[PDB]
Design a protein around this ligand. Structure first.
Ligand code: MNH
Ligand code: MNH
Ligand code: MNH
Ligand code: MNH
Lengths: 452, 452, 449, 451
């Protein structure tokens, strides 16, 4: 027995998620019913933890294990058995994990950084070419940056998203697919032909995505191959344990997975970091100073971008306030007892609200809402289990260091070359396409005319 | 004692079966473990056999009988009392064997061949009517051909599967059900919330298959009948021993088993044979000559298939390297010692790795991986029980001559009417749905301008 | 004479239905021979009476006018023969180039590829289960689209190998549906229509892309096929002395693809409907196909010899045309009908379906269908039967559409009987062209070659 | 006086009805001869095809610039800009004396640094292509040329490479030019057959004018310490009048320069590259010269001026296919032209540049072969023989502006790429008042040289 929102007859607790912002509404519900409230759609039942005292127990890997949320299962139609959408028990998870983790080591990050240059630059000089009347769309440009970055770094493919003014075809099809997956949780009945058009769209969109994967495999095969991208490790790499590589199906699924998960979250992070820095003009200066004093060169090396640090505080704080991956699901291997008086049968599903967890007064204090980059000056103070926006344990985000290195590079370059002034009095708008992203975020940045 | 693979505690070997390719994992395991290796899962034990000298004893009709594999047991729900899934100490198996065996014969093959041509003509016309730029998905189009062949010949129903862009609903549902069979074997815990979703799906898919069979009986019921056919021999066919016709409820099961087992195996065989013919030019040239000399008339005759010698040799060699039916299971009918080294209590289950059996270097020479049809120039020279791709004894594929007849006829016409080009130097990737088929195998086939 | 006016939006709200042309039919039966359909920013007059229509088509003072629908179609059809004025340079030029391709001898040239596609359709209907029923409009679009692809551009769409509609058809119906939806929109600058534009552009690219595919397929092949494409690429108009530039030819490929599949599929669908509804009428068509064509595959001469089916097709066009209307404008200022002055540039809309239902010229039983009514074509006065347009602007692919209809229909009727088990109630789906919706029939073969 | 076939009451206007008026007139010039008379309803024009007869046409004493019918239709949006201005117009002398000096070869050095930036974008877009992709040469050259002229002269960045489709200005301008050319081939414009064009046409002007609004607002708002064509216009007091230009004429000049200064130049680059790829030895010589002369990552002005053979190839491409298809003049009083042809006052005189180079009397025979060796020494070419940039004071003011970037950009390309004519392109030419090869595509594999 647990508090739960009102039950609508045979439809149960499902129809409360009937809005464009389902994840954002679950926070408002959690503040009411408490740290956990049971949620019950037809058949499926979940529980949403909002306080660390219980989330820490859910995160013990011997007790509980990552579960695919009702949304991630719908994602499986194009993501397949990739790292994000594969069960930990499917041999593909551990196989691909051990195969692809070497690509995110410290030594491979140095090789990726020079490729990150191309696209961070490729954003900076785009903004240097803009005239005084034009405002710049931060989410739309951050998505371009991040997608180009993951393409060129991990798959040696240039999306050239800055050379198109409207989103890349892959981006439109992907947002359609994620929007559809979020809308499928909605549908009391997805079986009715009333959504048949959606199905026709899904395959269609997937086509585009799949087609792009073809372009990434077709070129490298015929390409002059002198690079060790993530793609070479997918095609030619072998698993230490299995002893055998990935099958074609899972290779394509991993390519799709990394495109989506490598650009969406990171672009949302850059957009939120800006929103809070542009909203608070008094946080910029130090950071700016930092870049200017930390970057002796206009184009930096991995030692220089590793030497900059305060950007880490600024950026980490955006995820603490608004993580671009809002939640993850877990399940119970055995009939353990959670948080004291909570007992769970085998396979009971558990969701955790990363934003609401991070929005806990006991650990972070009463002033949770405040955007404070101060908190992260020390890594040691916060308990490990309280704050984690990249997942938990072995199922934590595999490309965390990649994401953060890219984000600091881009954000610090922005603050180094430009002066940002909020000229739109933006009201907060958080679009949910399986992920959290500021919607309509528009700012303009007067250049600092700093040469290369 | 008996070697065995790595057991993770309670679940023992069972967690190994999760991979997309279980049979290939077992082949890898057999390469290291040896002739035979034990394989114990919670609640089930089976010993996998890879050396021919053990296979010859396991195959003896007076030594070991057929046992239902763990996956075949789950297959029963749609297939059931059909011979492939029926027991040997089963009533319906004996009745159906005695009365459906006469439906396969020289006279029978003659009955089916004229109608086979039609479907093969649909295939040839589709590939002839493709534009120059287009390419052919061999396994997909082979399943397309095989369904229509078996349907039109043995059930007087045209699936019209060639007129469909996507796979037939029967194909989708059948593949998905086989998915659950395999994936629930590999499953540790039988009950869990999540599986219910799966469970739902598998009620759905099955129904489609059921629904489809309802047409064959209904269609023939309404339309004209009394034209010697498998479906006739099921409706009006009578048991010589008991003077009894088949149970209608059991006739439908027969239809399921035949539809399923008549395409997947033959289509996988055709795809594999075309693949191996593509990797070696000379082995094609010889067969392209054979098809021309043996088949002069535009439509192949019932005699002209038997006149083709090299086509059958190519098919048998391709079936040797990758037998489309990967394994069969057998239980001991009385207490025996296998090989004189391993004692087995009666009823113990042994699985047989057919592809690993064909790779035994002692019998097939020390170049087993080499694909040369010439091995089957004198098929009499092959040792006894060394080559059993279709099965063993009474329990082995009543329509194996139909398998060979359709596959030889089709492949003869394919090599006659077309020129095959490989644009990707395809990386061999084997997708397993309890049956082996190449995945991603695409070639182009230029026209040779031959009539009808 | 004018229908009801709503605000400054004039009578535009009256066309805000699924089937605008049907509403117009009601309105001229209500308001008489002619009526002015005023709209915000565009004014035209709909004409339904043979007495005025026959006068309207004389090219002395009349020239073809692009209707609003054709103006919107110009975004993808462009400068092609269908969406260009007679004054426009590419109409005269490319029409002189492509007109030799529609000669009866050239028609013989098309006959063979047409027979390939027709036998493909007859096959799909010969592989029919007893359970299966055919969707006539959906399969007929396949027949006509593959026919034009193969015969005019030597490109096999393989539409019959697709139970789902071809990507070209999906994108094209979205674009044409948008052309129809842009008429009823009160204001086009609304931001809520921005999405509608994207898919529209999306819909266009598909079409364009497929067009480009054809040009690639032709470039690398044995160059031995005489069709529309070889003519457009290399042909030269004697007076102009020049071939078509690269940008025009793409518009011509799009133009012909659309105009060859949609209107023709409509004709054969409606003709099958009418044959189904009247058993005797249909008996004669099957019987004439049997007597006149003995060969397994029709000969060109045998297609031309068929005349009952020609009556059936012309009479189906009479009751229901597939091109619903054509628009003309006054070359110079003139007066029509004696009671109406018309300044230069005032445009008229000749409504083909009501024109065919003029009681004076065709008798009172205009609603009643009978191919026997076309037993003497010269007996019928001039411009009584104008479903193909006026003068030079009349359909350049008249004989191609008629040859396909006659040939294919003869094959269908000779090969088996047709049975409307569904007793389908005629619902005409309007997408710039008149096409029935949901018309499904079962035809059990006569087992002949 | 030789005339082509008068089809009917419409004089011989149906002769230009084909979309390629210049190509048809060029065939007609081969057949009819050195001069032929072409008359439309209400106007008569003379098309000259011979250098000896054009020689008298060149003299300013008897002939001065007259706006052609096409240019007169262009004037609607172009206004009294330098291109569509009369010589006997108060704004021509003003804007000429004020803007003639801005194209100085010494003023070119200030342009160079911004002129290489847009070329950096071109080379980058090509370098950053994936192997499966190809370059639309004219479509990308138009982006380069538009950004080049806009940035160098008006300090405005169109960012044409950042838009996958052509710029809004480009589409509206192409429709305006196509419209002005279309109005040429009309017996009577009054009828409402293409009165619809009149809304569309006017619509286009808005866009262009509206875009020009932005170019006035970005210069005033932000600080503008930039010397350029627009800065010269903004202040720009004429010495003769003693008075600056008014904003009636300022916007007209901005529009005039944008259109006339990217269209023709992108056409030139495309033509020259097509010729280079069709002729491998000429290419190889020019590409190796580009390697020798350009030793810096960012080229230097002196290096662009040093390239003689790149300019020679550009001049040969211009000679064969001049981007400006024709220029027209008017006569002073009565004079005898050629000795066989007399003319009254104000008689129209339109020079057909492409056919001028085709006549044997100068370049000898083999006029159609692309041989960039005809410009070895500039002096041996007869003076008055080669006039692709106009005549006299009505010669192109941008001759200095066009060639520099043309030598620069082209040079840069030859330095960083190897070009392959995979399509084996069959030549097709489009003339929206300016000649450019339509649909010409190549693949460009990089030389991996840094910038
Ligand atoms: C912003 C940055 C960012 C955030 C907030 C982020 C958040 C997450 C969260 C939360 C999870 C756990 C999901 C779950 O249901 O348990 C997760 C898993 C994952 N993430 Mn990421 N992630 C990236 C950047 C981020 N990830 C980037 C960049 C990549 C690609 C290079 C990436 C690739 C993954 C993959 C792959 C997984 C799945 C890992 C696994 O299951 O083994 N990521
Ligand atoms: C390639 C072609 C092909 C292969 C490799 C093939 C493989 C097999 C194998 C192996 C067995 C025995 C399984 C076991 O556990 O002992 C078997 C039995 C069977 N097969 Mn088939 N089989 C076909 C073609 C093949 N079969 C075709 C074609 C049909 C139908 C027309 C068919 C119908 C059967 C039936 C029915 C059985 C059951 C025989 C029995 O149990 O009495 N088939
Ligand atoms: C049913 C068959 C059928 C009908 C009713 C039909 C109706 C018309 C009508 C009506 C017009 C012109 C009326 C106007 O003034 O705008 C017209 C013009 C045209 N049609 Mn067709 N048309 C076809 C079949 C038909 N067309 C077929 C088939 C093709 C292609 C092969 C085709 C290609 C055209 C073209 C092209 C034009 C424009 C030619 C021109 O006006 O110069 N077609
Ligand atoms: C190669 C490229 C190129 C060619 C072949 C070219 C050709 C011409 C020709 C011919 C004329 C004369 C037209 C006539 O009717 O008299 C002319 C006039 C002109 N052109 Mn430019 N021109 C440019 C590049 C060219 N122009 C560029 C670049 C600019 C702008 C920077 C430019 C700006 C003009 C202007 C302005 C005029 C009008 C000068 C005048 O008559 O006052 N130009």
């Amino acid at each position: 027995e647990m508090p739960q929102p009102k039950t609508f007859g045979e439809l149960k607790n499902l129809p409360l998620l009937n809005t464009d912002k389902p994840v954002q509404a679950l926070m408002k519900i959690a503040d009411e019913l408490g740290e956990i409230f049971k949620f019950e759609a037809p058949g499926r039942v979940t529980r949403y933890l909002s306080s660390q005292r219980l989330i820490k127990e859910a995160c013990d890997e011997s007790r509980f294990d990552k579960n695919l949320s009702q949304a991630l299962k719908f994602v499986r139609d194009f993501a397949g058995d990739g790292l994000f959408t594969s069960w930990t028990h499917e041999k593909n998870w551990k196989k691909a994990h051990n195969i692809l983790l070497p690509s995110f080591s410290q030594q491979a990050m140095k090789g990726y950084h020079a490729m990150m240059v191309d696209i961070a630059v490729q954003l900076v000089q785009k903004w240097e070419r803009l005239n005084a009347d034009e405002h710049i769309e931060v989410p739309e440009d951050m998505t371009r940056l991040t997608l180009d970055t993951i393409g060129l770094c991990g798959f040696n493919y240039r999306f050239n998203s800055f050379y198109r003014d409207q989103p890349h075809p892959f981006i439109t099809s992907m947002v359609r697919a994620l929007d559809e997956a979020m809308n499928k949780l909605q549908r009391a009945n997805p079986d009715d032909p009333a959504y048949d058009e959606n199905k026709r769209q899904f395959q269609e969109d997937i086509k585009v995505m799949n087609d792009l994967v073809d372009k990434i495999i077709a070129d490298r095969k015929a390409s002059g191959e002198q690079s060790d991208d993530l793609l070479t490790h997918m095609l030619n790499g072998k698993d230490p344990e299995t002893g055998e590589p990935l099958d074609d199906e899972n290779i394509r699924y991993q390519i799709i997975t990394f495109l989506i998960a490598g650009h969406e979250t990171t672009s949302g992070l850059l957009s939120f970091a800006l929103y809070f820095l542009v909203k608070n003009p008094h946080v910029l200066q130090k950071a700016a100073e930092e870049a200017a004093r930390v970057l002796v060169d206009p184009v930096p090396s991995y030692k220089q971008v590793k030497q900059l640090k305060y950007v880490g505080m600024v950026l980490n704080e955006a995820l603490r306030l608004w993580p671009t991956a809002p939640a993850f699901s877990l399940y119970a291997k055995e009939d353990t007892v959670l948080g004291g008086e909570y007992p769970l049968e085998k396979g009971d599903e558990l969701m955790v609200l990363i934003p609401q967890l991070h929005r806990d007064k006991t650990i972070w204090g009463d002033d949770v809402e405040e955007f404070r980059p101060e908190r992260f000056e020390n890594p040691s103070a916060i308990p490990q289990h309280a704050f984690k926006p990249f997942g938990n344990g072995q199922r934590a985000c595999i490309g965390q260091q990649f994401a953060l290195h890219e984000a600091t590079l881009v954000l610090g370059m922005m603050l180094k070359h430009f002066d940002f002034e909020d000229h739109t009095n933006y009201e907060l708008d958080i679009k949910e396409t399986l992920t959290l992203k500021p919607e309509g975020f528009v700012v303009k940045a007067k250049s600092k005319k700093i040469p290369l």
